[PDB]
Amino acid sequence: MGQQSVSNKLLAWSGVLEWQEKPKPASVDANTKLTRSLPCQVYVNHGENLKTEQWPQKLIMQLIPQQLLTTLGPLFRNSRMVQFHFTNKDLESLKGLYRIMGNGFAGCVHFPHTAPCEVRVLMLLYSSKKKIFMGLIPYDQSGFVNGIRQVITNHKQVQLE
Numbered sequence: 001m002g003q004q005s006v007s008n009k010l011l012a013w014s015g016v017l018e019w020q021e022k023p024k025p026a027s028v029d030a031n032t033k034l035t036r037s038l039p040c041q042v043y044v045n046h047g048e049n050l051k052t053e054q055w056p057q058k059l060i061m062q063l064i065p066q067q068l069l070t071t072l073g074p075l076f077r078n079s080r081m082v083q084f085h086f087t088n089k090d091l092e093s094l095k096g097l098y099r100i101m102g103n104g105f106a107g108c109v110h111f112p113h114t115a116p117c118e119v120r121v122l123m124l125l126y127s128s129k130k131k132i133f134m135g136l137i138p139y140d141q142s143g144f145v146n147g148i149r150q151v152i153t154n155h156k157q158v159q160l161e
Contacts, residue, residue, distance in 0.1 A: 009043035009083045013052035016040070017109065017124070019061040019097075026152055038097055042135055043083035056117060061124060062108040064148070069106050071151040075144055076123070076136060084124065084133030101126035108148060121145055 003011045018037035022030050037058070044050065069076065088094045101107060107124030111117055121144050123136035138144045 003041060003085075003087075005041075005085055005087075006043050006083060010046050010048070012042045012044040012048075012050055012082065013055060014039070014041040014087075015055070015057045015059055017059050017061050017107075019063060019107070022063060025062065025064055036093070036096065038094060039087050040133070041085040041087060043085065051118075054117070056112050056115075058112070059122070060110045060112070062110070063100055064106050064108055066104045066106055068148070068151040071147050071154070072144065075138060075140065075147060079123065079139065080135075080137035082135040082137065084135045086133065098126065102128060 003014065016037050017040045018035060020032050021034040021036065022032065024030075042050075086094055086097075101124070109122040109124060111119050111121075113119075119141065121138065121141045123138065125134045125136060127134055
């Protein structure tokens with residue numbers, strides 16, 4: 001008798017996703033004081049449940065360009081899929097986030113480095129024309145990050161169709 005905003009999904013684990021305002025990870029000023037964190041709820045199949053007993057409530061998300069997601073083509077499709085629900089209060093607070101992921105950007109989430117917790121990377125995507133969010137949980141986290149950080153290093157290379 002709690003979070004039942006979904007009809008074809010079941011409450012898995014809700015948490016506050018933090019994310020600052022930044023154009024790209026290449027920006028030298030990537031580290032800003034503008035820290036906008038919005039509440040997100042992760043759902044799953046009927047009955048199904050993930051390992052989130054002592055998981056962190058505050059996750060660190062990073063707004064990155066989708067143009068780089070290409071390098072993670074086979075790395076994306078080969079990942080889990082969940083339902084993300086943003087339950088905030090203010091309007092602009094959330095609307096501002098839509099202007100970001102709405103343009104076509106990916107959200108790389110990472111776990112904290114304080115307590116002993118299984119480090120894992122979770123991708124976030126905004127579904128337009130439906131008003132919903134989909135969470136991508138890639139099995140290979142080590143191969144993901146490496147590619148997400150190396151994708152910007154291979155920017156130099158070019159080519160023409």
